[PDB]
Subunit: 346 residues, 4 copies
């Protein structure tokens, strides 16, 4: 039933020896490290230190390791108070996990001299000079492949285009093979999103050459060749934050599309029933005002043609207001996700 | 005039025995449960516990049951401190009512073996496999009734449509009767909004069949058949949150419509008086610029036709600014109501 | 050099007798009211009370009347602690002036039996039944005068209109005379904004009748007859909050108009210089793209006609982005003013 | 091993004499200034003062000069507590640098009687009457030069314009020479942005006169004459805040333009591939839907012409939603920068 008096510069605390011996790897736990500060006469351990920090430290032992920082104590002061009390790296990364920093992982490096040099050359551009050369050459090759895609579909042209496209495909396949064979773990390579993007960027050229030298299919292939824009996400950090934002916000995008569908059916029905007994109106069905309701609710504008009645113009006024209301509701959640993932960098 | 000294790990509190005996059902109220911690020599009750939590607990007795959590104490720590002090379930749900959680109701179940099984089968879809089957069949029947409504009004057609519509009405009436006759309390059934929606979804078919086998009326009936979209609110949780948001925000919607009316009258008057002495302008009245002012203030756009004078274009510039200002003012209150009801789920 | 020990339920405070006698109208100031709580043996004044509240109360005397509420003490608890300490109504309305409530004025009533009855009948509608009758009759007369204004300017008509307009003017002048002759202070009557609005609502009828029974002038008079919409601000509380918002935000409205002017001159110059060597473009001057730049920056839309070059479409893309940026900057300050004046009601 | 007891009105603190002597220029550091408050009997220094402020002051010595204000202490109370403790102007501007006020610089004045008078006359308009006269004359000359620029390019005219333009250039060069020769430090003059703006405002007149009395070049010169709008930034404080905002937000503007480029390429590709097998569609290439995708994503509107298929209208619906999402993401960071630099004035 022995007690112990800990005096943090005038603010006197008291507890049991069991609570101090529950963590016998800290400053106050072992009976010899804390006799550094013991005063024989006053029977107390005088720590000329910080007082709100010590009431948080004393709660950590009582809570059996549950941790929190008081709201009136700054992070650096509390950090070096944890360090002074030598609570433990367990308690330190508990405090980090509690505050919410993502400082937990360090990705490995290949176990050889040759692999380490080519993997750090082709993967980490901040290292060397040749690394920045590979980065700038890669961004330029991606940009000219986009230009070749759009110029292919111009009507003055429809071969130099096949030669430029096959040079771009040679460079893409070359750096994909070099990145694959120089990686540390091949089990991780078929889980990165960017390596899947590079594979889908080089596939349709090879299947076109195969079936060409051996309706919906060829339209799918000509629209799947547009996924070479997403090869810029390796060199752009705002695009990676945009992908993280869009993955964290999938319920809000579904709600946006669902609310717009409900409003389009409702206001198309209303404007068609308001303009049926008028032979000079343009709405001939309810599936004919769908596009008018979409461009009125989003505020793009349908052009000169307008409802022609009085009830149709009252319905159009309500459609223009209701779209602003409908769209403005799930969008602050998506911009909060963006602000979170974006300022997480600092 | 006896005092009592309560020592929360060094932080010494003092009060009267009357204040402790005012709640004689707690830990400190009865004279035998709190002699667990009484120290005979120091004449104090040593609780090796949390200090800001205890100043809140000591205030609860003094305030005669008024409760609050200090701003520097987290909710779980204060919750188990209330639990340790055994303040009472009265004090615990007072603390819950103070913080503002809606954890108060549990809706009943029918008092029989048969009724409980069919009511939980047709009302709670998360229970069983047949429950999810009934849910998916119901959503599919609602969707094909919407498709039948719009395809009915196409002009290439205007019978398979009557057969599909009467099958949909048979399913709606069947599940309405099964939900009605299997419910616990029939006094609650004519107060849910969704049961009223189901009744209005099946009424106009039956009154059309009745008066057909026995202007504004038939137009009202053909526009009241569109309320089958709101039968999706039973299966969608975002739509229920949208209804709660729109009911909590009825003053702000009235202010939005009132501000837009004031602006439409004002800017229509101004643009007509700016373009009266010009024979090539299109505004022939003040009730002819109402629609131009609506689409300019909302930013939809009126199309190619524009004011034709210099004063008319100065008035149009001010209309385009004033609509943004007018609309942007009552909308943050509606999106705060949405964020409240939406994150209330977690 | 006498000290005094004040013991707030265990938390011991200490000060000088000079600091307590500096306010000798309070509980601790006079030497007989505070001997209610003095303990002769322990030489202290035991107040079984609230501890953070007492450190704020002890600071009030030291600061010579400067007051503040601690951030960890709620408003009702601190209010009744001020009341318990009987600091003074001076200190109580200092605390109210510090927190920022507008509970300071009570507007007078006429000093007679007859004047008090007609002034409360015609000014305060929440009193009686005839008061609500006068309110509803007034709103209906204002609404039919607005309808008469717009129907006057229709072209099928251009007398019942003169009879309806002269009945509306008789009612406006009647209630203006009754409100003027029944008011308590006639010095305040020519400072309310609403009485000036009523005078401007009845003036142009009388000057038209005078000069008619005795270009810019008559156009000014026909546009000054539109100020009868603002007679609804007496019966509407959202419109009064809108007027307070617009008066508090006059620097931000000037910045909005100035930023839009800078952008219109800049992008009109750029699009004209990008499309000068092309005979099929529509911009013939820099003062001919002013209206295109206004409707592109505000997002209303100019219609089918578009820049016709490549440099003109690059300039148009930048105009569409820059308007969103320019407009979005001074608008959160205006909506914060609105939220302040609007939630000030509760 | 001597200790010292400091009693802040009942709240007793304790520390070592080394910690107090570490700053021997303050109130508690020198052994004679603090014997003002020493009580010989109780062996303590009684400061009838503020208690949370003193725990912050005691931490300052322990942290070796690191400073912070507690979150529960207001700024004026803590300021005069620092002043009472005479911590030092070093500690006072450390506290100011910690809170984040920009009260650090005072710009010099010329070292002569004549230079000081003309520099304060032509640079500081708030001083005198002639200073405000120079300010109003300068703003009027800038405004008529803008009017001359636009009226020059009207087609009814294309000499009074050369005379008005040469008078404006004489005034600009005159005040530039007077401001240059009367300044204190000529090393600072070629680093202000506004003096560079004045030089670029007077250059192209002189090079036109030189090469005229001695394609892309003359188009560059006729578009560089538009930089006379930015001479209003000396007389306008909202424009200076806009320039500070736009310089602090250069990463967010690049992200806005990059996200819009990605979306334009994506939705142009999709709408062209959705409308290729239809001879009545208007999209003939992917570089022909670029402008439609820009005006649909920004909500300006493309006019009457619309996608003509069903897949094209589904793609157009997604384009109209995706632009709102894309644009709304980096814009709250720019408006937070604006609010910061704008309310920094108060
Ligand atoms: K538009
Ligand atoms: K728009
Ligand atoms: K349009």
């Amino acid at each position: 039933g022995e007690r112990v008096v800990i005096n943090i510069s005038g603010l006197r605390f008291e507890t049991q020896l069991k609570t101090l011996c529950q963590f016998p790897e800290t400053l106050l736990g072992d009976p010899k490290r804390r006799m550094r500060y013991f005063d024989p006469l006053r029977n107390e351990y005088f720590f000329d230190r910080n007082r709100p920090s010590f009431d948080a430290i004393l709660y950590y032992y009582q809570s059996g390791g549950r941790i929190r920082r008081p709201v009136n104590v700054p992070i650096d002061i509390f950090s070096e108070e944890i360090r002074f009390y030598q609570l433990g790296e367990e308690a330190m990364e508990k405090f980090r996990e509690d505050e919410g920093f993502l400082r937990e992982e360090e990705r490995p490096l290949p176990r050889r001299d040759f692999q380490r040099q080519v993997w750090l050359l082709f993967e980490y551009p901040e290292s060397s000079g040749p690394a920045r050369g590979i980065a700038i050459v890669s961004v330029l090759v991606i940009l000219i492949s986009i230009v070749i895609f759009c110029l292919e579909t111009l009507p003055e042209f429809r071969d130099p285009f096949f030669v430029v496209e096959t040079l771009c495909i040679i460079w893409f396949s070359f750096e994909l093979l070099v990145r694959f064979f120089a990686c540390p773990s091949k089990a991780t390579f078929s889980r990165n999103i960017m390596n899947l993007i590079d594979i889908v960027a080089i596939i349709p050229y090879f299947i076109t050459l195969g079936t060409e030298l051996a309706l919906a299919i060829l339209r799918v292939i000509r629209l799947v060749r547009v996924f070479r824009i997403f090869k810029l996400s390796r060199h752009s950090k705002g695009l990676q934050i945009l992908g993280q934002t869009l993955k964290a916000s999938m319920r809000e995008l579904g709600l946006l599309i669902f609310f717009l569908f409900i409003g389009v059916i409702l206001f198309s029905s209303a404007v068609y029933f308001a303009e049926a007994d008028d032979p000079t109106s343009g709405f001939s069905s309810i599936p004919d005002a769908f596009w008018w309701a979409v461009v009125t609710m989003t505020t793009v504008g349908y052009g000169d043609m307008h409802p022609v009645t009085i009830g149709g113009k009252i319905v159009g006024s309500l459609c223009a207001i209701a779209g602003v209301l409908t769209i403005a509701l799930p969008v602050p959640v998506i911009v909060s996700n963006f602000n979170y993932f974006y300022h997480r960098e600092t």
